[model samples]
Target: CSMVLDVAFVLEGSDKIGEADFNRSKEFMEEVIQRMDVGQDSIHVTVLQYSYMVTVEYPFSEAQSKGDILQRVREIRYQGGNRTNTGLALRYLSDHSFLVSQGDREQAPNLVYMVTGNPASDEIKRLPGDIQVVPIGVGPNANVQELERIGWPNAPILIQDFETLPREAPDLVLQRCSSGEGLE
Candidate 1:
């Protein structure tokens, strides 16, 4: 039996998601998705790219191929809002995206992969049960302790920047998918 991962790649725009102006290097999400068994089953992916705003790129309700999914992720606009307020984004996401109405499964493990490099404007609020966060901190200004606090009980993964993220995201996703925690 394989793992069932209903995951959201919650990325913060620029600097933390980096290369800053955010045009070229945010391909790490594509890397992580490519490494997974993505489809209608096995793994269902949702994408949320945020700054002061949250742009829902894809939803769990939409199932596509790994190639198409990667293509969509590559095109995700580097929407710069001048503020790194994840609190606002998470508030909408927790209530809107991961709900049963939005295609998240009952038995699958729900993971919110918060990939960023800046301090959030407000503290992360409590998420509903069965929803887990996998925080990946990037760059020197990534605010490590904050990600750790959001990931609580689970340590956050770290990388130098967006360029380095492509190399590490597969490892990050694969490691979790390989573990029974995602399915068992």
Candidate 2:
């Protein structure tokens, strides 16, 4: 793990997700962060919330410390709305989140994990830079059937129950090393 990973979280804040599930998703996100080597030279993490509108809860530049990132994540309020806008959030990432000036290391691989949606695979393909998306389908109605198409090369990570994530999903949780510099 001498290489780098710019991990981004694109989560839904729609009313359909509910307050309880909202917190649940956030908690799982925290667990993912806790396992990463969160540091400026190692891994940079960003948080984005998407509903009918999208909010940059935190950006890559502000993610030097895990403690502060967690605080920012905890402060995010549930943005209630009927529509979940994945397209807008993905566009925002290409425009702002992963840019070099935004604290993103161009040398690092971008790994994105999005919750509950199958907007389309085409949206992710056109994204700029070396980005890999891992879609997360939570609950039965998460519209998981098309997740594989979105995740593409990487199988979509499924979260059927909040409880199982801590157990069965750990192996599914997470790579690296022969390029001399680093390997994916």
Candidate 3:
């Protein structure tokens, strides 16, 4: 039997990380997506890229196959900007990304894997209990406190750089979700 999961990848597209790092982050995400059983009944993924503004690259219903999703992931261009409005991005994800109308499964485990190298300028609001937020801090510039605050309590993952993110994040995510701990 396949487990059901709804995942939202909230990526930071700021000048702080540079275009190369941002692109590497996308590659990291693509690698993880490749490992999942991506379909309507399995793991559904939605990608949101944010810097000064938020862009929904694709919704959960955009692709029902791994190849299609990989292609979409490759097509995503970096939206470089000076400011990092993570709070606004999180708010947008909370308000628009996880809606049942937007293909979110009510009974499935909903997770947000937020990748950022900076802190939020605006206030970060608490999300619904059902939606677990797992913040991944990239680079030495990442604010650990802020990432911890944005993620599920005691469950934030911090990596030294974007290069290591692809190697580490996917397994950590699967472990966290499988354990079903710290998400309460």
lDDT of 2 by residue, 1-184 (tens): 2347887887777887776777777777777667667777777789888877778888998857888888898998978656777667777677788888987888888877777633432243335436666667676656554656555555567777655543434345442111212113
Write the residue-wise lDDT of candidate 1 on 28-139 in tens digits.
7776787778887688888888887788888787765677777788778787767777776676568866887888887888777777778886657646656677777777
Stretches of candidate 3 above 4 Å error? Answer: 181-184
Model 1 poorest ten-residue lDDT run: 16-25
Would you list the clashing residue pairs of candidate 3? Answer: none
Candidate 2 Cα errors over 4 Å, as ranges: 117-129, 163-171, 175-184
Whole-model lDDT, candidate 1?
0.71
User: Least accurate stretch of 10 residues (summed lDDT) in model 2?
Assistant: 175-184
**Clashing pairs in model 2?**
none
What is the C-alpha RMSD, rounded to one decimal, of candidate 3? Answer: 2.3
**Candidate 3 TM-score, C-alpha based:** 0.91
In terms of TM-score, the best-performing candidate is: 3
**Structural similarity to truth (TM-score) of each candidate:** 0.87, 0.82, 0.91
Global lDDT of each candidate: 0.71, 0.68, 0.78
How many steric clashes between backbone atoms does each model show?
A: 1, 0, 0
